[PDB]
Design a protein around this ligand. Sequence first.
Ligand SMILES: *[C@@H]1O[C@H](CO)[C@@H](O)[C@H](O)[C@H]1NC(C)=O
Ligand SMILES: *[C@@H]1O[C@H](CO)[C@@H](O)[C@H](O)[C@H]1NC(C)=O
Lengths: 383, 383
Amino acid sequence: MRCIGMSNRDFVEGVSGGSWVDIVLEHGSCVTTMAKNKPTLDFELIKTEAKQPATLRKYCIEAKLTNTTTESRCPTQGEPSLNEEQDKRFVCKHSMVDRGWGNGCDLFGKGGIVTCAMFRCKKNMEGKVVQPENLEYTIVITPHSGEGKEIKITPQSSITEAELTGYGTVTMECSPRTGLDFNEMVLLQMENKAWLVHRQWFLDLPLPWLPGADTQGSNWIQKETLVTFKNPHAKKQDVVVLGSQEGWMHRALTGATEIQMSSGNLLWPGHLKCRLRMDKLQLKGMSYSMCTGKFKVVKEIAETQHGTIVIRVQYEGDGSPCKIPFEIMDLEKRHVLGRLITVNPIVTEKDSPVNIEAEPPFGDSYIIIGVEPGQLKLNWFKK
Amino acid sequence: MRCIGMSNRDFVEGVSGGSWVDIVLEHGSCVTTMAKNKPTLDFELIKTEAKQPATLRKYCIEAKLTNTTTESRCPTQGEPSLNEEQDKRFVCKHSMVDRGWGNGCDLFGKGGIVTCAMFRCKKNMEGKVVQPENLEYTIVITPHSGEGKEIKITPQSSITEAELTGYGTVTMECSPRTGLDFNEMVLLQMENKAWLVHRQWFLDLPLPWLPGADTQGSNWIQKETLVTFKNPHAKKQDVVVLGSQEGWMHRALTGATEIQMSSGNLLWPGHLKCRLRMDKLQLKGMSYSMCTGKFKVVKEIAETQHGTIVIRVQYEGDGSPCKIPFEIMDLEKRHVLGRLITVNPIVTEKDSPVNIEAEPPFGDSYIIIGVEPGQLKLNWFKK
Ligand SMILES: *[C@@H]1O[C@H](CO)[C@@H](O)[C@H](O)[C@H]1NC(C)=O
Ligand SMILES: *[C@@H]1O[C@H](CO)[C@@H](O)[C@H](O)[C@H]1NC(C)=O
């Protein structure tokens, strides 16, 4: 479930001296709002989507060499230039070797030689500069009824409305924060994890890179960082790559800042500070008859991780949509004790199970739910 | 070809005041020995094989995780221990999550959870301590005839003999050197290249390692260096590797000392200082008649990279195995000028081509090869 049973959930209650109550919404946390005559709402931040990030530079971390050619000459015959020297998709190397009889040349001496190989990247990571203003926050408002409404907000339109399903409307004004010095900070993505590193530290990485505005994927820059030519023997210099740089990147990003994922969705850390105005909220119910008084416990008392207690029951009896007779009594039945979180428990159908939550006082307490013809008298010992 | 036309070739001549001449044999270099009445020999170091190296430790650089299991519990139900915790081939992780209704548990609160995954290494490098005394050096001695004898030496048996094919025998005494502080130095092998690194720097590498005496390949030590558990959500913590560490190793070994290969054979740098005693060497020939005097130039004059000049000719004429009339004359035919490198050029067969090498003086010189009935009078301009 949500909110109830979430270790990171804060309660808040609007005073009777006005409205405009402040809440703090963060990812993985729920906020519970309530007041007298006002319905209880649950606010939760779902995802923080940073749409339209600007690709800054693309580095290659795993490449492969194919189409390796080699051409040699004899002493006093000129250098052996290859056509692949005029191709940015290739990397070449010149050298000189000893030439004479046993290798089939004119005379003795230093003969030139050239070896080229096609550079083709296989796996490559990316880096993007992210804009702070065009961020998007998804918030879910749920009426705490026990039987959600989404809203997208952005720093360029912090004011919004919320047409709840039969509960009225509530006004929101949020102000955000999500990091540190975003303009000169780059989100690095390895197509498996994500980090937030410095701009200068990212721009000067010793790897074959391509500019942001690029779709070629073959005219890289500084390919020699992943390509080394071995010592030439008879002819071919035996060019060789340097394997994969995935582990080097995973190890070099230790002192960075990683961002988890929810299968695609980036979990951006940060908190929204929001003002809520609930003066235009109505309670779904009120004008309802009382139920006949038969209730069967689907499952009885169970305290949450925030002092509040919850019971799930079913109406079963017939009496239309009606209000649940619910009272919190002493060890006897003197006065009413704890308050109610799920304000005005209603019933949509006799077969639909309904949960209810409330905060009891210390020690022994009674819960009277249902009229006498089938009254549920559930005792418990809080704390 | 060899020796002739090798840019790293040194000449040496034994004086008439005894024998025991010193030479320096290194990989990729040839030594030319000669003297009056003594045949010319070519010494070359082929391979430096360090047989029987002692494996010290085996590190893994590319692993993969399979057989991932996960088990959870409810609050006040105990921790969920898995059977894979008692298996060194697995890596596990404990955690606690929020549990209540929507995830099917008893009540609310912190419920334990455990996730394990089988650690299986795919590609792994090795490190070996190498012994200096049990080194093996392969030397090739070739009689400079123009138409080789191998010997294996070790520091534990530096004295040897050389039964040349019809030239007598020569005595050798070599003393070696090949590096720096071998006892606390480890040869690192990645099954593609080889380095020589420090012992302490190698023993403390942050990678899953196994002791030297090991054939298991699955009960590694410190596997968590290549395994990280992501944040748990509903149940599985989503364990993930760190890719491949091949690039990290290839980059970290920059300030080391690399060793090239000749397809399997390690090219150990170093020089052997050898004493040669050639007093028991005879010249294959001497008691031979002179040829009739017909020679056709297979290919004429061509100077090497060490001042010496070479011509390849064929006998063609009939006259049994005979000695070649060969003289170096002035611009006229006054006196004999340059000496001869291929001492006493013989002939095995009239159809077998034969090379000849000699050093001429400055400027113009004549080469008289063959008796007058078909005499070859080849002029050239050295320097
Ligand atoms: C590389 O070699 C393959 C196989 O011969 C060939 O199909 C391909 O066209 C070559 N590419 C280049 C750029 O030469
Ligand atoms: C891992 O899973 C495969 C596929 O189910 C199975 O064949 C293998 O026996 C499993 N290994 C272990 C150690 O559980």
